[PDB]
Design a protein around this ligand. Structure first.
Ligand code: NDP
Ligand code: 8Q1
Lengths: 134, 395, 347, 250, 84, 127, 216
């Protein structure tokens, strides 16, 4: 991107960048790696309420495990940002946003479906695929 | 046994009527104000609701293109572009490269005039009238390009399904290139009068503050997103034409105030100039409309020499093409934000449902949150940054 | 309610549509005096129902601007140069017309035109021109209630003589004789208000004894329509008085009340004094152009017509024969216009 | 747990009872928006507990172990009225009768040890005996005496000048003129003299704070003592709570 | 509890009851149910109560409107109420 | 705290009509309609507006109709609509009906419509 | 989540490979498996984002719309932080005439999703304004044009149509020209509404061919 400010600032400082783009609005906290680890572990604790054989709980477990791994090999907090395509602050806000909808999911219990549940899926086949070759 | 504390009451339910130094169109605004400070803003719309969406249902697809030009009178090309893209997606029609280049070029041109009008009319609303008149001469130079390609300065109806209506007239590329050679200097002249001016700074700084979360929540797009720190552009994130080839950088600011969005719009004009130069240099040669004559009209000599071409001409100018049953939503980066058309086809020659997604509708919805705690004078500036067009808001 | 036809010959063929602006009514009308207060509403009533109205007017584009909106495309025809002394223009105006309405009248004399010209010569000449044609089926003339041959005022006497001439040439003409007409553009309440507010003293002839029967403009306009929708009305004079008979003192008092004037500004300028103050000023009027400063009120004719009772004769045709209930002019919508000025909660 | 709309603000630091190493009970303390009021000459024993909307008039004596809880509704104790040892005065939220549920005690009223009063009207110059229970809505009219070990059932009345006894309290005898005039007032005056004595040998800040100050000074010397701006922290906690309450979806 | 004379308030209420199209003819007195004797509709009953609102300068509760049923009941309600 | 002595919408439209009647004076003052019309006179029109929708019996359709009628009231109450709107749509037709004098037609309903127009279903203007 | 600007240079990529794959081909299956009760059927078709890709369409019932929207916004993998628009389509041939359409954006996934709730004239759709503040005006417009009631809406009012308009114009049974017309009267100095009359009627030209096959 291009800064629209005539003033000259250094965007490799990795803090002047965050101040310029307004990440501080998202969270006033610094957003270090340990905070991300704590947030992921708190999400893992929270999803315990969801039944063990629930696809949603398995999904959250898999995502949290993937992100805890990405924290594992990468000792640099910026490296985690590059791998996850996000600022550490918004990665931390992500788990809280996930926490917000757990009550709404525990009220309706979407995972309860009969053992004959079937969702019909219709898929589109493009003519370019067939016409050019088979 | 601890005393309770009472509060104060707000009155002054003003009615702010159609008012000339504001975003163009008719705005009826009901404002509840505690003293000189606003507590609620309720925009009253429907004053330019012409029933466009229902009228589209009674017209053929090619007959409904001029509706999109008149939805937004500032940016016509971008508005008709989404409609033609949606019809092309449903029809599975491939646009030739020269027509794709012509569409991108004229889209950038209309983007530039939109930004010129927005900035200079906003300055006029503040009370500075010199940038405004300094800008009309540039806007005339660009209207002259439109009248050259289409014969209409405003409602060209130049973009068509599968390409463009006619080819670029000889000598146009040179003239556009000259306007481009001088455009940057003209923009710098305008920028000095606005930027750095203490009264302009005081009027615009820290007014209309928006945060990224608020923008996504309210569905805002374009300059509002980019003035708050969001690196999101449809031309880059979701390319729709030869925009992917084009090399340009997103302008980003972080504060979200009125000034940041003004700076973003100026830089957007500069980026559009860069895209135009690339379009001019890389303009290909060949067909400007799709070779298929079951979706595009035949050429006049061809209709006058061939039976199949006369048949195709007759059936395309009487019945029109039949669009296969399906639904699609195609969005384009309009100068005011994201403009999209949700087209539902049942297999006939007329659209069954054509929903128009207004970029300015959500901004006018955001007006109340933004204009809380402000003053009667700040409303004009806040409306200016939203840059709302009420024919565009009221379809 | 069932729409009643305009009782004109061969209307059944030409008429078509619901009766609105875009419908076809088989009435082509030449309304003389269209730009006037009475004429404009008659034009509105006729043109509203899809009919075509020819409006001869003395050159004045701004005065005839409201008539342009009255009808759909090609329905309101405005003829630019109207002269009461020009026969050929009158023949051209009524060429296609099957009904002719005459609302041309002058409240005061000038140097160019006197009462005898406008109120006598024009009706007779127009009557002959209409009679020779034969296509014109209905003729309506608008006159005052107090018009009589044995009247002191020259205006009300000349009007009656012209009406008799019209009756002689066209026996089937209908003479509409409304009272003082109340409206937004009327010359009754508006002149009374201007007298009460922007005049040093409000002179009242005698003590306001004279009785009047004011009527609302919409009632007279509807009465014209009811005249045209019945052929049995032809050859008859209708005294379209208002629902209530009021003395002039009551109307002045009630205007003072509605406007919430501080007190009564009216004075007693009894008769036999106005007959000496205004008598030279009439000779002044007949030798000078139209002047806004003095007019209508400041004439001996007005004093003479304000010393008599302008009320409907007992045995007479009126609104009841036309099945119209006149609206009261001292209450309701009729009085809103004076009400907007001041009601004591206002300013 | 934490009341965020409390009049003085939320609690920045809350300590568990297990972590307490000394007794911190306060003889007068505030329960949220309800504040006890006392006169200058009102004696509250160190053991005694007075909380809530309790109004103590002049010469009121609260002796050792007495609990006057004004949490549900208002308690008023009249002039020269003594609450003796281990006697509980409490107020109900509502009364069964439908009248006001405040516990109003008149002047020169002696509540003998271990007597429980809840949402009752006690008239002037009355004696409630030891282990006497006066239930909600029961009204004792002035110059009446309830004998020890007696219960006044809810919504019941003891007339003036009468001595009542029994678990279903019943009339026993009419109190004599000398009794009502002198002795009932004299008992309250005697207990006022005893409480005046106890007040006279009480120091304003008795030397029990020194022991806690020694621990605080040790923490200061070893550099574990932390200076906390409780005012700012309360403000920040309330701000965070409001932001979270706005964010929540359900 | 009658703040003002029973005869006066009754005459006034029956005067307003007469104003309604029906509720007249042979029986316009007390002991007449609005909907079962007088042919009144529920909306007409509510409007009649509002007209009594204008006559006696005092409001009627909506739950009381659910409770009111007769000409006796309305006059009883208006006599009972001190503002009257 | 206990003694044995201690403890011892079919008409939604009616509520909406009550709301309209109670809000009538406010719209009279807001729309400057005191002199033109009386409160009772408007209260009469509102009933006819309610009576047009009598045939419906479904609860859900009733809910929608009530919501729409509340919207109609709110337009006048919040000054969305103007004084001339109130004159044109309520007060003027009601006053016109009172001022109307008509001859009791001896011809039946069929004869009158037959004389009037070929297609009775088409409306007539300015009758 | 929120596409806050992070990379200063070389952000030429449209998105990462894994993020594209998870949303190119697993998105509908992931939704169905994760929240099965909400989904009734799913359609993969031509993409809203682009011509080349494929974007999901999910059909759900009115009762589950609020929970499905809440799941879509805040699920870590699926973050549809934006409501592009809300729309209804009238199908008079169907018993359940109206199809309420929701269009969403995930900036993180760079994907578009379409959610459909099929209702009739009497049934109501719960408002999703608490999930997305932009919904308020969109649901007000849907109520105005089509007559679909939205439950628990803060203030459901008409937006586009004239004051006093009772009909819903975008219903297929509503005349193109409407029922009334507006004119100024000289007699009554007011602008008034009258029944419709057309000087020239709208000419419907029937261009359909017997031999056409695309018509469904
Ligand atoms: N109070 C009332 O309004 C009443 C009126 N009437 C009668 O109805 C008639 C008109 O009423 P009103 O409309 O109020 O009077 P107006 O003067 O308002 O209308 C007069 C019309 O006649 C035209 N006119 C006057 N003199 C001449 C002329 N010499 N040559 C050509 N055109 C001329 C005027 O045109 P220009 O404007 O160019 O003069 C105007 O259009 C009068 O005769 C009046 O007596 C009946 C009852 C009461
Ligand atoms: C100037 C401002 C004027 C405002 C005008 C407002 C006009 C609103 C018009 C809306 C009309 C409706 O709501 S119609 C409400 C729905 N219609 C129904 O019929 C449901 C049940 N109906 C009945 O019971 C009877 O018909 C009934 C006669 C109603 C007896 O009312 P009650 O149920 O009590 O007994």
């Amino acid at each position: 991107f291009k800064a629209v400010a005539d003033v000259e600032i250094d965007f490799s400082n990795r803090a002047v960048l965050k101040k310029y783009v307004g990440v501080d609005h998202l969270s006033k906290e610094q957003g270090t790696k340990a905070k991300f680890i704590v947030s992921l572990n708190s999400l893992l604790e929270a999803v315990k309420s969801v039944p063990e054989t629930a696809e949603y709980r398995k999904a959250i477990e898999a995502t949290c495990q993937y992100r805890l791994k990405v924290c594992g090999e990468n000792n640099s907090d910026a490296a985690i940002e590059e791998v996850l395509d996000a600022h550490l602050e918004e990665l931390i806000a992500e788990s809280k946003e996930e926490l917000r909808i757990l009550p709404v999911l525990l009220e309706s219990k979407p995972w309860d479906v009969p053992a004959d549940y079937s969702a019909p899926v219709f898929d589109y086949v493009d003519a370019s695929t067939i016409l050019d070759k088979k | 046994m601890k005393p309770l504390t009472p509060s104060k009451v707000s009155n002054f339910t003003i009615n702010f009527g159609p008012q000339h130094p504001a975003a163009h169109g008719v705005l009826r605004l009901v404002l509840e104000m505690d003293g000189e400070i606003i507590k609620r803003a309720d925009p009253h719309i429907g004053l330019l609701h012409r029933g466009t969406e229902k009228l589209l249902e009674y017209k053929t697809y090619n007959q409904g293109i001029p509706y999109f030009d008149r939805l937004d009178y500032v940016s016509m090309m971008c508005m008709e572009h989404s409609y033609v893209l949606a019809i092309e997606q449903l029809l599975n029609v491939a646009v030739p490269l020269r027509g794709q280049y012509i569409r991108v070029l004229f889209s950038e041109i209309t983007r530039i005039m939109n930004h010129i009008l927005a900035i200079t009319c906003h300055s006029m609303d503040v009370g500075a009238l010199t940038p405004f008149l300094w800008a009309f001469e540039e806007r005339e130079k660009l209207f002259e390009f439109y009248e050259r390609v289409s014969g209409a300065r405003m409602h060209a109806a130049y973009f068509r399904v599968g390409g463009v209506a006619q080819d670029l007239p000889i000598g146009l590329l040179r003239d556009i290139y000259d306007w481009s050679r001088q455009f940057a200097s003209r923009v710098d002249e305008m920028e000095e009068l606005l930027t750095g001016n203490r009264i302009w700074k005081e009027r615009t700084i820290d007014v209309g503050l928006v945060t990224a979360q608020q923008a996504w929540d309210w569905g805002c797009s374009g300059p509002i997103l980019r003035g708050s720190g969001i690196d999101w552009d449809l031309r880059k994130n979701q390319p729709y034409d030869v925009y992917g080839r084009m090399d340009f950088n997103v302008p980003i600011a972080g504060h979200g105030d009125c000034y940041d969005r003004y700076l973003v719009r100026v830089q957007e004009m500069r980026e559009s100039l860069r895209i135009i130069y690339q379009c001019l240099n890389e303009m290909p040669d060949g067909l400007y409309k799709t070779p298929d004559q079951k979706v595009s009209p035949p050429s006049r000599g061809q209709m006058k020499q061939s039976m199949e071409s006369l048949i195709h001409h007759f059936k395309l100018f009487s019945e029109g093409y039949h669009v296969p049953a399906g639904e699609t939503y195609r969005a384009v980066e309009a100068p005011k934000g994201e403009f999209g058309v949700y087209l539902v086809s049942r297999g006939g020659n007329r659209p069954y449902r054509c929903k128009i997604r207004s970029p300015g509708y959500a901004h006018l919805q955001m007006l109340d949150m933004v204009a809380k705690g402000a003053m009667l004078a700040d409303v004009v500036t806040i409306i200016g940054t939203l840059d709302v067009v009420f024919g565009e808001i009221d379809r | 309610s069932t729409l009643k036809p305009f009782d004109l010959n061969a209307n059944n063929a030409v008429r078509n549509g619901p009766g609105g602006r875009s419908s076809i009514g088989g009435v082509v009308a030449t309304v003389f005096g269209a730009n006037g207060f009475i004429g404009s509403y008659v034009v509105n009533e006729i043109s509203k129902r899809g009919n075509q109205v020819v409006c001869p007017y003395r050159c004045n584009e701004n005065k005839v601007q409201p008539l342009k909106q009255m009808g759909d495309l090609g329905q309101v025809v405005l003829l630019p140069e109207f002269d009461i002394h020009d026969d050929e223009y009158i023949r051209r105006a009524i060429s296609r017309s099957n009904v002719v309405i005459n609302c041309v009248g002058i409240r005061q004399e000038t140097k160019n035109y006197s009462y005898k010209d406008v109120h006598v010569d024009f009706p007779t000449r127009l009557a002959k021109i209409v009679a020779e044609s034969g296509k014109v089926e209905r003729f309506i003339q608008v006159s005052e209630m107090g018009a009589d041959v044995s009247h002191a005022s020259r205006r009300l006497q000349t009007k009656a003589v012209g009406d008799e001439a019209i009756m002689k040439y066209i026996p089937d003409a209908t003479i509409i004789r409304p009272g003082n007409v109340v409206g937004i553009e009327d010359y009754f309440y508006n002149n009374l208000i201007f007298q009460l507010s922007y005049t040093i003293v409000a002179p009242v002839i005698n003590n306001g004894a004279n009785k009047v029967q004011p009527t609302y403009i919409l009632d007279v306009a509807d009465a014209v329509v009811k005249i045209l929708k019945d052929k049995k009305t032809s050859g008859k004079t209708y005294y379209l008085g208002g629902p209530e008979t009021l003395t002039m003192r009551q109307i002045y008092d009630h205007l003072i009340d509605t406007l919430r004037l501080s007190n009564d500004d009216t004075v007693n300028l009894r008769y036999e004094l106005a007959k000496m103050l205004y008598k030279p000023l009439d000779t002044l009027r007949t030798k000078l152009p139209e002047f806004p400063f003095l007019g209508f009120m400041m004439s001996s004719d007005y004093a003479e017509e304000q010393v008599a009772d302008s009320v409907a004769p007992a045995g007479s045709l009126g609104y009841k024969d036309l099945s119209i209930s006149p609206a009261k002019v001292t209450e309701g919508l009729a009085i809103e216009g004076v009400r907007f000025i001041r009601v004591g909660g206002y300013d | 747990v934490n009341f965020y709309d409390a009049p003085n603000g939320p609690a920045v630091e809350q300590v568990k009872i297990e972590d307490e190493w000394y007794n911190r009970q306060r003889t007068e303390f505030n329960i949220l928006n309800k504040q006890p009021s006392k006169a200058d000459d009102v004696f509250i024993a160190p053991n005694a507990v007075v909380c809530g909307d309790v109004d103590l008039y002049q010469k009121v004596s609260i002796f050792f172990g007495a609990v006057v809880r004004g949490d549900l509704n208002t308690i008023r104790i009249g002039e020269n009225s003594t609450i003796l040892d281990k006697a509980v005065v409490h107020a109900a939220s509502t009364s069964p009768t439908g009248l006001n549920a405040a516990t109003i005690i008149g002047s020169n009223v002696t509540v003998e040890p271990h007597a429980v009063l809840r949402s009752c009207r006690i008239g002037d110059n009355c004696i409630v005996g030891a282990r006497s229970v006066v239930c909600e809505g029961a009204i004792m009219h002035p110059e009446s005496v309830l004998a020890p070990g007696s219960v006044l059932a809810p919504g019941r009345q003891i007339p003036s000048g009468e001595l009542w006894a029994g678990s279903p309290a019943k009339f026993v005898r009419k109190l004599t003129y000398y009794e009502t005039s002198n002795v009932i007032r004299e008992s309250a005056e005697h207990y006022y003299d005893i409480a005046t004595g106890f007040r006279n040998e009480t120091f304003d800040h008795g030397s029990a704070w020194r022991d806690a100050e020694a621990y605080r000074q040790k923490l200061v010397d070893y550099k574990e003592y932390n200076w906390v701006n409780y005012r700012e922290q309360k403000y920040v906690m309330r701000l965070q709570r409001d932001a979270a309450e706005l964010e929540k979806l359900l | 509890s009658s703040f003002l004379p029973k005869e006066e308030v009754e005459s006034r209420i029956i005067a307003q009851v007469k104003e309604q199209n029906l509720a007249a003819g042979i029986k316009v007195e007390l002991s007449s149910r609005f909907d079962k004797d007088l042919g009144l509709d529920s909306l007409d009953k509510v409007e009649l109560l509002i007209s009594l609102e204008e006559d006696f300068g005092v409001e009627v509760p909506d739950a009381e409107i659910d409770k009111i049923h007769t000409v006796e009941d309305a006059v009883n309600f208006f006599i009972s109420n001190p503002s009257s | 705290m206990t003694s044995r002595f201690a403890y011892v919408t079919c008409q939604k439209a009616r509520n909406l009509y009550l709301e309209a009647c109670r809000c009538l004076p406010f719209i009279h003052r807001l729309h400057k309609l005191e002199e033109i019309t009386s409160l009772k006179e408007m209260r009469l029109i509102i009933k006819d507006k309610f009576r047009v929708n009598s045939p419906v019996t479904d609860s859900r359709v009733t809910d929608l109709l009530i919501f729409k009628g509340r919207e109609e009231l709110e337009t006048y109450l919040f000054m969305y609509k103007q004084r001339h709107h109130a004159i044109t749509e309520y007060i003027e037709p009601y006053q016109i009906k009172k001022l109307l004098i008509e001859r009791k037609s001896s011809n039946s309903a069929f004869l009158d419509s037959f004389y009037e127009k070929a297609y009775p279903l088409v409306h007539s203007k300015y009758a | 989540s929120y596409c806050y600007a992070r990379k200063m240079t070389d952000k030429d990529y449209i998105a990462y490979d894994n993020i594209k794959n998870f949303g190119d081909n697993y998105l509908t299956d992931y939704i169905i498996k994760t929240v099965p009760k909400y989904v009734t059927m799913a359609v993969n078709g031509p993409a809203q984002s682009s011509v080349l890709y494929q974007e999901p369409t999910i059909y759900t019932t009115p009762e589950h719309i609020y929970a499905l929207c809440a799941f879509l916004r805040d699920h870590v993998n699926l973050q549809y932080k934006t409501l592009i628009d809300i729309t209804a389509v009238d199908y008079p041939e169907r018993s359940a005439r109206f199809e309420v359409v929701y269009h969403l954006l995930s900036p993180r996934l760079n994907n578009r999703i379409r959610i459909k709730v099929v209702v009739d004239e009497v049934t109501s759709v719960p408002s999703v304004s608490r999930i997305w503040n932009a919904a308020n005006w969109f649901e007000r417009e849907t109520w105005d044009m089509f007559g679909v009631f939205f439950s628990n809406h803060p203030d459901l009012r008409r937006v586009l149509t004239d004051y006093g308009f009772t009909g819903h114009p975008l219903r297929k049974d509503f005349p193109l020209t409407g029922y009334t017309e507006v004119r100024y009267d000289y007699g009554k100095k007011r602008v008034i509404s009258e029944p419709l009359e057309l000087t020239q009627e709208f000419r419907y030209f029937d261009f359909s061919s017997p031999w056409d096959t695309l018509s469904r």
